[PDB]
mmCIF file of all heavy atoms in Angstrom:
data_model
loop_
_atom_site.group_PDB
_atom_site.id
_atom_site.type_symbol
_atom_site.label_atom_id
_atom_site.label_comp_id
_atom_site.label_asym_id
_atom_site.label_seq_id
_atom_site.Cartn_x
_atom_site.Cartn_y
_atom_site.Cartn_z
ATOM 1 N N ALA A 1 0.820 -1.208 0.000
ATOM 2 C CA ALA A 1 0.000 0.000 0.000
ATOM 3 C C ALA A 1 0.862 1.270 0.000
ATOM 4 O O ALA A 1 0.510 2.244 -0.678
ATOM 5 C CB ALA A 1 -0.931 -0.006 1.189
ATOM 6 N N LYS A 2 2.009 1.249 0.724
ATOM 7 C CA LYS A 2 2.939 2.374 0.753
ATOM 8 C C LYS A 2 3.531 2.626 -0.620
ATOM 9 O O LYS A 2 3.540 3.776 -1.083
ATOM 10 C CB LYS A 2 4.056 2.138 1.755
ATOM 11 C CG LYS A 2 3.631 2.369 3.171
ATOM 12 C CD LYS A 2 4.801 2.339 4.094
ATOM 13 C CE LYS A 2 4.307 2.575 5.506
ATOM 14 N NZ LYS A 2 5.416 2.596 6.478
ATOM 15 N N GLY A 3 4.008 1.564 -1.263
ATOM 16 C CA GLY A 3 4.585 1.646 -2.595
ATOM 17 C C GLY A 3 3.559 2.094 -3.606
ATOM 18 O O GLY A 3 3.837 2.927 -4.475
ATOM 19 N N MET A 4 2.351 1.582 -3.460
ATOM 20 C CA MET A 4 1.233 1.909 -4.331
ATOM 21 C C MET A 4 0.783 3.346 -4.187
ATOM 22 O O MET A 4 0.529 4.003 -5.192
ATOM 23 C CB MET A 4 0.092 0.920 -4.121
ATOM 24 C CG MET A 4 0.316 -0.365 -4.867
ATOM 25 S SD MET A 4 0.405 -0.035 -6.639
ATOM 26 C CE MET A 4 1.420 -1.226 -7.068
ATOM 27 N N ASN A 5 0.759 3.860 -2.951
ATOM 28 C CA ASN A 5 0.399 5.242 -2.671
ATOM 29 C C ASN A 5 1.474 6.155 -3.214
ATOM 30 O O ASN A 5 1.150 7.264 -3.629
ATOM 31 C CB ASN A 5 0.185 5.467 -1.187
ATOM 32 C CG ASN A 5 -0.243 6.869 -0.846
ATOM 33 O OD1 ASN A 5 -1.378 7.306 -1.102
ATOM 34 N ND2 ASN A 5 0.669 7.610 -0.283
ATOM 35 N N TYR A 6 2.740 5.685 -3.275
ATOM 36 C CA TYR A 6 3.840 6.489 -3.834
ATOM 37 C C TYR A 6 3.610 6.684 -5.325
ATOM 38 O O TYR A 6 3.721 7.806 -5.828
ATOM 39 C CB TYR A 6 5.220 5.844 -3.583
ATOM 40 C CG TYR A 6 6.344 6.556 -4.311
ATOM 41 C CD1 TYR A 6 6.886 7.736 -3.810
ATOM 42 C CD2 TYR A 6 6.849 6.065 -5.515
ATOM 43 C CE1 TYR A 6 7.878 8.419 -4.494
ATOM 44 C CE2 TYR A 6 7.848 6.745 -6.212
ATOM 45 C CZ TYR A 6 8.355 7.923 -5.699
ATOM 46 O OH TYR A 6 9.349 8.605 -6.358
ATOM 47 N N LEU A 7 3.273 5.586 -6.029
ATOM 48 C CA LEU A 7 2.988 5.622 -7.466
ATOM 49 C C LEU A 7 1.827 6.562 -7.733
ATOM 50 O O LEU A 7 1.879 7.306 -8.701
ATOM 51 C CB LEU A 7 2.714 4.205 -8.024
ATOM 52 C CG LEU A 7 3.847 3.158 -7.871
ATOM 53 C CD1 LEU A 7 3.386 1.808 -8.328
ATOM 54 C CD2 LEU A 7 5.105 3.538 -8.662
ATOM 55 N N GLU A 8 0.812 6.582 -6.833
ATOM 56 C CA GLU A 8 -0.353 7.472 -6.936
ATOM 57 C C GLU A 8 0.102 8.930 -6.858
ATOM 58 O O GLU A 8 -0.283 9.712 -7.717
ATOM 59 C CB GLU A 8 -1.426 7.125 -5.886
ATOM 60 C CG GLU A 8 -2.628 8.053 -5.955
ATOM 61 C CD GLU A 8 -3.963 7.561 -5.442
ATOM 62 O OE1 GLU A 8 -4.012 6.499 -4.776
ATOM 63 O OE2 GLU A 8 -4.967 8.271 -5.686
ATOM 64 N N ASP A 9 0.978 9.273 -5.881
ATOM 65 C CA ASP A 9 1.585 10.602 -5.760
ATOM 66 C C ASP A 9 2.290 10.957 -7.071
ATOM 67 O O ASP A 9 2.146 12.070 -7.557
ATOM 68 C CB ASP A 9 2.622 10.633 -4.624
ATOM 69 C CG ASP A 9 2.047 10.728 -3.235
ATOM 70 O OD1 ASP A 9 0.875 11.152 -3.103
ATOM 71 O OD2 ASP A 9 2.782 10.425 -2.272
ATOM 72 N N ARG A 10 3.023 9.992 -7.656
ATOM 73 C CA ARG A 10 3.736 10.162 -8.916
ATOM 74 C C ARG A 10 2.835 10.109 -10.153
ATOM 75 O O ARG A 10 3.354 10.153 -11.269
ATOM 76 C CB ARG A 10 4.886 9.144 -9.018
ATOM 77 C CG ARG A 10 5.959 9.322 -7.934
ATOM 78 C CD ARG A 10 6.576 10.713 -7.917
ATOM 79 N NE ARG A 10 6.900 11.130 -9.281
ATOM 80 C CZ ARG A 10 8.077 10.944 -9.855
ATOM 81 N NH1 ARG A 10 9.089 10.436 -9.162
ATOM 82 N NH2 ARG A 10 8.269 11.304 -11.116
ATOM 83 N N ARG A 11 1.483 10.059 -9.962
ATOM 84 C CA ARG A 11 0.463 9.982 -11.027
ATOM 85 C C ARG A 11 0.709 8.765 -11.967
ATOM 86 O O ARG A 11 0.473 8.840 -13.168
ATOM 87 C CB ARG A 11 0.355 11.307 -11.812
ATOM 88 C CG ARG A 11 0.564 12.570 -10.986
ATOM 89 C CD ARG A 11 -0.025 13.786 -11.665
ATOM 90 N NE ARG A 11 -1.071 14.370 -10.825
ATOM 91 C CZ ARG A 11 -2.360 14.418 -11.147
ATOM 92 N NH1 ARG A 11 -2.777 13.957 -12.322
ATOM 93 N NH2 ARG A 11 -3.239 14.951 -10.308
ATOM 94 N N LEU A 12 1.187 7.644 -11.396
ATOM 95 C CA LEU A 12 1.530 6.420 -12.113
ATOM 96 C C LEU A 12 0.515 5.280 -11.894
ATOM 97 O O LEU A 12 0.346 4.817 -10.765
ATOM 98 C CB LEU A 12 2.906 5.980 -11.647
ATOM 99 C CG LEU A 12 3.721 5.269 -12.689
ATOM 100 C CD1 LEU A 12 4.941 6.116 -13.107
ATOM 101 C CD2 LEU A 12 4.119 3.888 -12.207
ATOM 102 N N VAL A 13 -0.164 4.837 -12.967
ATOM 103 C CA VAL A 13 -1.122 3.737 -12.867
ATOM 104 C C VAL A 13 -0.358 2.472 -13.265
ATOM 105 O O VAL A 13 0.095 2.366 -14.403
ATOM 106 C CB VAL A 13 -2.440 3.995 -13.663
ATOM 107 C CG1 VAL A 13 -3.381 2.802 -13.590
ATOM 108 C CG2 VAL A 13 -3.157 5.238 -13.143
ATOM 109 N N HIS A 14 -0.137 1.562 -12.302
ATOM 110 C CA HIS A 14 0.663 0.346 -12.496
ATOM 111 C C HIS A 14 0.134 -0.596 -13.593
ATOM 112 O O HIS A 14 0.892 -0.982 -14.493
ATOM 113 C CB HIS A 14 0.833 -0.380 -11.174
ATOM 114 C CG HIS A 14 1.840 -1.474 -11.208
ATOM 115 N ND1 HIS A 14 1.568 -2.687 -11.820
ATOM 116 C CD2 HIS A 14 3.074 -1.525 -10.661
ATOM 117 C CE1 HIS A 14 2.656 -3.425 -11.648
ATOM 118 N NE2 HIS A 14 3.588 -2.772 -10.954
ATOM 119 N N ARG A 15 -1.152 -0.963 -13.500
ATOM 120 C CA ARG A 15 -1.932 -1.811 -14.409
ATOM 121 C C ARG A 15 -1.572 -3.311 -14.355
ATOM 122 O O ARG A 15 -2.217 -4.088 -15.063
ATOM 123 C CB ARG A 15 -1.903 -1.298 -15.856
ATOM 124 C CG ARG A 15 -2.466 0.105 -16.025
ATOM 125 C CD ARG A 15 -2.259 0.631 -17.429
ATOM 126 N NE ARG A 15 -3.095 -0.075 -18.400
ATOM 127 C CZ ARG A 15 -2.634 -0.912 -19.323
ATOM 128 N NH1 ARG A 15 -1.330 -1.139 -19.431
ATOM 129 N NH2 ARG A 15 -3.471 -1.514 -20.156
ATOM 130 N N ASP A 16 -0.593 -3.733 -13.519
ATOM 131 C CA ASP A 16 -0.244 -5.151 -13.408
ATOM 132 C C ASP A 16 0.201 -5.512 -11.984
ATOM 133 O O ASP A 16 1.206 -6.209 -11.807
ATOM 134 C CB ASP A 16 0.776 -5.588 -14.487
ATOM 135 C CG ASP A 16 1.007 -7.092 -14.719
ATOM 136 O OD1 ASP A 16 0.225 -7.911 -14.190
ATOM 137 O OD2 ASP A 16 1.970 -7.442 -15.440
ATOM 138 N N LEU A 17 -0.544 -5.023 -10.954
ATOM 139 C CA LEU A 17 -0.196 -5.350 -9.577
ATOM 140 C C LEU A 17 -0.775 -6.731 -9.256
ATOM 141 O O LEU A 17 -1.946 -6.993 -9.557
ATOM 142 C CB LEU A 17 -0.686 -4.276 -8.596
ATOM 143 C CG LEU A 17 -0.567 -4.616 -7.101
ATOM 144 C CD1 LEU A 17 0.890 -4.852 -6.686
ATOM 145 C CD2 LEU A 17 -1.250 -3.580 -6.249
ATOM 146 N N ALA A 18 0.067 -7.612 -8.682
ATOM 147 C CA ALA A 18 -0.230 -9.004 -8.334
ATOM 148 C C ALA A 18 0.912 -9.509 -7.463
ATOM 149 O O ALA A 18 2.000 -8.940 -7.521
ATOM 150 C CB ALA A 18 -0.311 -9.855 -9.605
ATOM 151 N N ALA A 19 0.693 -10.598 -6.691
ATOM 152 C CA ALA A 19 1.739 -11.193 -5.842
ATOM 153 C C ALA A 19 2.980 -11.651 -6.656
ATOM 154 O O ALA A 19 4.089 -11.570 -6.128
ATOM 155 C CB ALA A 19 1.182 -12.323 -4.968
ATOM 156 N N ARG A 20 2.819 -12.037 -7.947
ATOM 157 C CA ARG A 20 3.980 -12.386 -8.794
ATOM 158 C C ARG A 20 4.875 -11.150 -9.077
ATOM 159 O O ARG A 20 6.030 -11.330 -9.450
ATOM 160 C CB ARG A 20 3.553 -13.031 -10.128
ATOM 161 C CG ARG A 20 2.947 -12.036 -11.107
ATOM 162 C CD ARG A 20 2.360 -12.645 -12.374
ATOM 163 N NE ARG A 20 1.407 -11.708 -12.984
ATOM 164 C CZ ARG A 20 0.092 -11.729 -12.765
ATOM 165 N NH1 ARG A 20 -0.451 -12.682 -12.009
ATOM 166 N NH2 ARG A 20 -0.693 -10.813 -13.321
ATOM 167 N N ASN A 21 4.326 -9.909 -8.933
ATOM 168 C CA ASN A 21 5.024 -8.634 -9.199
ATOM 169 C C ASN A 21 5.453 -7.867 -7.929
ATOM 170 O O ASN A 21 5.610 -6.641 -7.937
ATOM 171 C CB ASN A 21 4.191 -7.753 -10.126
ATOM 172 C CG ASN A 21 4.186 -8.286 -11.525
ATOM 173 O OD1 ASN A 21 5.135 -8.938 -11.966
ATOM 174 N ND2 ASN A 21 3.127 -8.026 -12.257
ATOM 175 N N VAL A 22 5.648 -8.602 -6.845
ATOM 176 C CA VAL A 22 6.095 -8.031 -5.589
ATOM 177 C C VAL A 22 7.316 -8.862 -5.253
ATOM 178 O O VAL A 22 7.206 -10.078 -5.079
ATOM 179 C CB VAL A 22 5.005 -8.010 -4.465
ATOM 180 C CG1 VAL A 22 5.566 -7.439 -3.170
ATOM 181 C CG2 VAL A 22 3.779 -7.202 -4.893
ATOM 182 N N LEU A 23 8.488 -8.223 -5.260
ATOM 183 C CA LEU A 23 9.741 -8.918 -4.987
ATOM 184 C C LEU A 23 10.137 -8.867 -3.529
ATOM 185 O O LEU A 23 9.738 -7.943 -2.804
ATOM 186 C CB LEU A 23 10.856 -8.412 -5.882
ATOM 187 C CG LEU A 23 10.680 -8.680 -7.360
ATOM 188 C CD1 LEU A 23 11.529 -7.760 -8.131
ATOM 189 C CD2 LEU A 23 10.964 -10.130 -7.703
ATOM 190 N N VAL A 24 10.902 -9.878 -3.096
ATOM 191 C CA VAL A 24 11.293 -9.997 -1.696
ATOM 192 C C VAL A 24 12.776 -9.702 -1.496
ATOM 193 O O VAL A 24 13.616 -10.529 -1.876
ATOM 194 C CB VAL A 24 10.861 -11.379 -1.103
ATOM 195 C CG1 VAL A 24 11.101 -11.448 0.403
ATOM 196 C CG2 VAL A 24 9.402 -11.700 -1.426
ATOM 197 N N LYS A 25 13.099 -8.526 -0.895
ATOM 198 C CA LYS A 25 14.483 -8.128 -0.576
ATOM 199 C C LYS A 25 14.935 -8.999 0.611
ATOM 200 O O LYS A 25 15.956 -9.689 0.525
ATOM 201 C CB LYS A 25 14.559 -6.634 -0.208
ATOM 202 C CG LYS A 25 15.978 -6.124 -0.022
ATOM 203 C CD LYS A 25 15.996 -4.779 0.654
ATOM 204 C CE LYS A 25 17.411 -4.373 0.913
ATOM 205 N NZ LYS A 25 17.514 -3.271 1.903
ATOM 206 N N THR A 26 14.140 -8.973 1.700
ATOM 207 C CA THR A 26 14.287 -9.764 2.931
ATOM 208 C C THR A 26 12.843 -10.161 3.284
ATOM 209 O O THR A 26 11.944 -9.437 2.853
ATOM 210 C CB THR A 26 14.931 -8.946 4.104
ATOM 211 O OG1 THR A 26 14.047 -7.929 4.572
ATOM 212 C CG2 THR A 26 16.276 -8.324 3.756
ATOM 213 N N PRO A 27 12.574 -11.234 4.085
ATOM 214 C CA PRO A 27 11.174 -11.558 4.447
ATOM 215 C C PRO A 27 10.412 -10.402 5.091
ATOM 216 O O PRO A 27 9.185 -10.390 5.070
ATOM 217 C CB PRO A 27 11.321 -12.703 5.451
ATOM 218 C CG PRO A 27 12.620 -13.318 5.139
ATOM 219 C CD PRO A 27 13.513 -12.201 4.687
ATOM 220 N N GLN A 28 11.148 -9.425 5.637
ATOM 221 C CA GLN A 28 10.604 -8.253 6.305
ATOM 222 C C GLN A 28 10.527 -7.019 5.390
ATOM 223 O O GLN A 28 9.979 -5.992 5.801
ATOM 224 C CB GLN A 28 11.345 -7.949 7.644
ATOM 225 C CG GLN A 28 12.855 -8.244 7.709
ATOM 226 C CD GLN A 28 13.247 -9.708 7.891
ATOM 227 O OE1 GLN A 28 12.572 -10.510 8.555
ATOM 228 N NE2 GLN A 28 14.389 -10.074 7.335
ATOM 229 N N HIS A 29 11.019 -7.116 4.142
ATOM 230 C CA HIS A 29 11.009 -5.983 3.215
ATOM 231 C C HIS A 29 10.685 -6.383 1.769
ATOM 232 O O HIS A 29 11.489 -7.048 1.094
ATOM 233 C CB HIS A 29 12.346 -5.218 3.302
ATOM 234 C CG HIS A 29 12.371 -3.894 2.592
ATOM 235 N ND1 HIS A 29 13.526 -3.135 2.534
ATOM 236 C CD2 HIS A 29 11.383 -3.230 1.943
ATOM 237 C CE1 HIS A 29 13.207 -2.051 1.853
ATOM 238 N NE2 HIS A 29 11.927 -2.063 1.485
ATOM 239 N N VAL A 30 9.533 -5.925 1.276
ATOM 240 C CA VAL A 30 9.098 -6.225 -0.097
ATOM 241 C C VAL A 30 9.008 -4.946 -0.969
ATOM 242 O O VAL A 30 8.916 -3.838 -0.438
ATOM 243 C CB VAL A 30 7.808 -7.105 -0.188
ATOM 244 C CG1 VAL A 30 7.970 -8.427 0.578
ATOM 245 C CG2 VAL A 30 6.565 -6.348 0.262
ATOM 246 N N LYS A 31 9.087 -5.115 -2.305
ATOM 247 C CA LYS A 31 9.025 -4.017 -3.281
ATOM 248 C C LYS A 31 8.175 -4.369 -4.513
ATOM 249 O O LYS A 31 8.247 -5.494 -4.998
ATOM 250 C CB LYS A 31 10.432 -3.597 -3.746
ATOM 251 C CG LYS A 31 11.319 -2.991 -2.679
ATOM 252 C CD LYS A 31 12.560 -2.389 -3.282
ATOM 253 C CE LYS A 31 13.588 -2.094 -2.219
ATOM 254 N NZ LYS A 31 14.638 -1.179 -2.720
ATOM 255 N N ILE A 32 7.409 -3.397 -5.034
ATOM 256 C CA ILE A 32 6.591 -3.564 -6.247
ATOM 257 C C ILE A 32 7.510 -3.513 -7.457
ATOM 258 O O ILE A 32 8.432 -2.701 -7.473
ATOM 259 C CB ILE A 32 5.485 -2.482 -6.359
ATOM 260 C CG1 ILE A 32 4.510 -2.534 -5.184
ATOM 261 C CG2 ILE A 32 4.752 -2.569 -7.683
ATOM 262 C CD1 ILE A 32 4.215 -1.212 -4.704
ATOM 263 N N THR A 33 7.240 -4.358 -8.473
ATOM 264 C CA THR A 33 8.010 -4.427 -9.715
ATOM 265 C C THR A 33 7.100 -4.533 -10.958
ATOM 266 O O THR A 33 5.873 -4.436 -10.837
ATOM 267 C CB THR A 33 9.042 -5.553 -9.602
ATOM 268 O OG1 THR A 33 10.148 -5.278 -10.464
ATOM 269 C CG2 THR A 33 8.446 -6.952 -9.849
ATOM 270 N N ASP A 34 7.721 -4.728 -12.152
ATOM 271 C CA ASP A 34 7.103 -4.908 -13.467
ATOM 272 C C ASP A 34 6.287 -3.694 -13.888
ATOM 273 O O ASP A 34 5.079 -3.592 -13.643
ATOM 274 C CB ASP A 34 6.306 -6.220 -13.543
ATOM 275 C CG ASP A 34 6.106 -6.756 -14.937
ATOM 276 O OD1 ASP A 34 5.136 -6.325 -15.611
ATOM 277 O OD2 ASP A 34 6.877 -7.647 -15.340
ATOM 278 N N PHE A 35 6.980 -2.752 -14.515
ATOM 279 C CA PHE A 35 6.387 -1.524 -15.019
ATOM 280 C C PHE A 35 6.150 -1.623 -16.533
ATOM 281 O O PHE A 35 6.054 -0.596 -17.218
ATOM 282 C CB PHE A 35 7.223 -0.305 -14.579
ATOM 283 C CG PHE A 35 7.161 -0.102 -13.082
ATOM 284 C CD1 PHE A 35 8.116 -0.671 -12.243
ATOM 285 C CD2 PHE A 35 6.111 0.604 -12.500
ATOM 286 C CE1 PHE A 35 8.024 -0.530 -10.851
ATOM 287 C CE2 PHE A 35 6.023 0.746 -11.112
ATOM 288 C CZ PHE A 35 6.974 0.172 -10.298
ATOM 289 N N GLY A 36 5.997 -2.867 -17.018
ATOM 290 C CA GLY A 36 5.708 -3.189 -18.409
ATOM 291 C C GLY A 36 4.435 -2.562 -18.949
ATOM 292 O O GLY A 36 4.366 -2.205 -20.126
#
């Protein structure tokens, strides 16, 4: 939701958000990906 709200601030519509598009840095830290 934090990453998603950031994209909203940046006026960016992702169009492909899903669990396959969320990468795991550490089990305690995840990031949104795939801006295709």
Side-chain angles (χ1 to χ4, degrees):
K2 282 189 180 182
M4 279 299 149
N5 182 72
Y6 172 79
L7 301 174
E8 179 155 12
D9 282 340
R10 297 303 315 267
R11 325 200 119 245
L12 211 113
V13 177
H14 191 285
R15 300 173 70 250
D16 194 11
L17 171 61
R20 73 187 160 266
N21 288 331
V22 178
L23 295 160
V24 187
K25 187 194 175 196
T26 69
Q28 35 282 326
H29 191 183
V30 304
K31 295 190 194 196
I32 299 137
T33 206
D34 203 275
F35 293 92

